[PDB]
Specification:
302 residues; alpha/beta; TIM Barrel; 8-stranded parallel beta barrel; two-stranded antiparallel sheet; 37% helix; globular; binds a molecule of 2 linked components (BGC-BGC); binds calcium ion; cellulose degradation; hydrolase; carbohydrate metabolism; cellulase activity
């Protein structure tokens, strides 16, 4: 119903809008590394998320490094499975080229261009697809001006060759926090969004003001990843500050994907160790994080 209702997404004055030009806010889950927790990504779990949680977007996090796509490109089959399930279930899907320890997106540029050429040729005609070309650029020597913008200026045309209009999300500096730098030197492609990522246990008002600065420059922002834990992963979850972030995003209608759908024993994980990979979870199978996120998505679902 989601995609059938909104169809082709586009950006209008920094806002994500549907084919009728009305505002659209996507809320959903991100998988964790597909090379580690790919079993949680399948038609049945995605359907359960759609039907029981109300998600309208699913994020496929395909690490490049850490035993990911660069060493074992077969993980790409798992990306296709998710994309096809999203098309079948009528929801949106983010193909995330998940850089992290490979902190400069230019490390695997050639591979990135080949991967997105293949994905855009396969799925470029479906409105469900959203491309995320560089999860989290990071490190003091990786900046918008010298490394990220040029990277995007080379990858975008590869995608645009096959898919002229689907949304493309571009990572920003300092683990996708430096949206203000990107907002002061924006890409020309009309259908682009800058990624902003945060941890509720760590980030607060200063980063919210930064996001507002970027929004005030006409930039579109997609919170393609955010956790309820502290970046340190200590102290549990911080649902009080998480709720402050939820409200802030609702005011600005920002779309988001929560990190992450896995049973790993870490505070940000939505499931408890042992949870069923195909969904149909009981309340006891969800973590405090998963319980809160599920409620945030349900409470605004139609
Ligand atoms: O268990 C898988 C893999 O996880 C790595 O840590 C993750 C963390 O679990 C996640 O919440 C965060 O977004 O990213 C980090 C980095 O990928 C861990 O470093 C690996 O040893 C481990 O094999
Ligand atoms: Ca099957
Ligand atoms: Ca081609
Ligand atoms: Ca298209
Ligand atoms: Ca170049
Ligand atoms: Ca992160």
């Amino acid at each position: 119903s989601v995609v059938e209702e909104h169809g082709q997404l586009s950006i209008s004055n920094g806002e994500l809008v549907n084919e009728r030009g009305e505002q659209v806010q996507l809320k959903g889950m991100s998988s964790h590394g597909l090379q580690w927790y790919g079993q949680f990504v399948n038609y049945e779990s995605m359907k359960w998320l759609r039907d029981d949680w109300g998600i309208n977007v699913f994020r496929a996090a395909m690490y490049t490094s850490s035993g990911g796509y660069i060493d074992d490109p077969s993980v790409k089959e798992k990306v296709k499975e998710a994309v096809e399930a999203a098309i079948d279930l009528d929801i949106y899907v983010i193909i995330d080229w998940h850089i992290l320890s490979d902190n400069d997106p230019n490390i695997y540029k050639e591979e990135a261009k080949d991967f997105f050429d293949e994905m855009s040729e396969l799925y470029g005609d479906y409105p469900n697809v959203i491309y995320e070309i560089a999860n989290e650029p990071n490190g003091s020597d990786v900046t918008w001006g010298n490394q990220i913008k040029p990277y995007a200026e080379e990858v975008i045309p590869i995608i645009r060759n096959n898919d002229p209009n689907n949304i493309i999300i571009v990572g920003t500096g300092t683990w996708s926090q430096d949206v203000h730098h990107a907002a002061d030197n924006q890409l020309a492609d009309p259908n682009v969004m800058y990624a902003f990522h945060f941890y509720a246990g760590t980030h607060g008002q200063n980063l919210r003001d930064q996001v507002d600065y970027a929004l005030d420059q006409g930039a579109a922002i997609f919170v393609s990843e955010w956790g309820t834990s502290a970046a340190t992963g200590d102290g549990g979850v911080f649902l009080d500050e998480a709720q402050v972030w939820i409200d802030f995003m609702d005011e600005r209608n920002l779309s988001w994907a929560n990190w992450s759908l896995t049973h790993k024993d870490e505070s940000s994980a939505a499931l408890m160790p042992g949870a069923n990979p195909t969904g149909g979870w009981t309340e006891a199978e969800l973590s405090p994080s998963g319980t809160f996120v599920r409620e945030k998505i349900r409470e605004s679902a139609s």
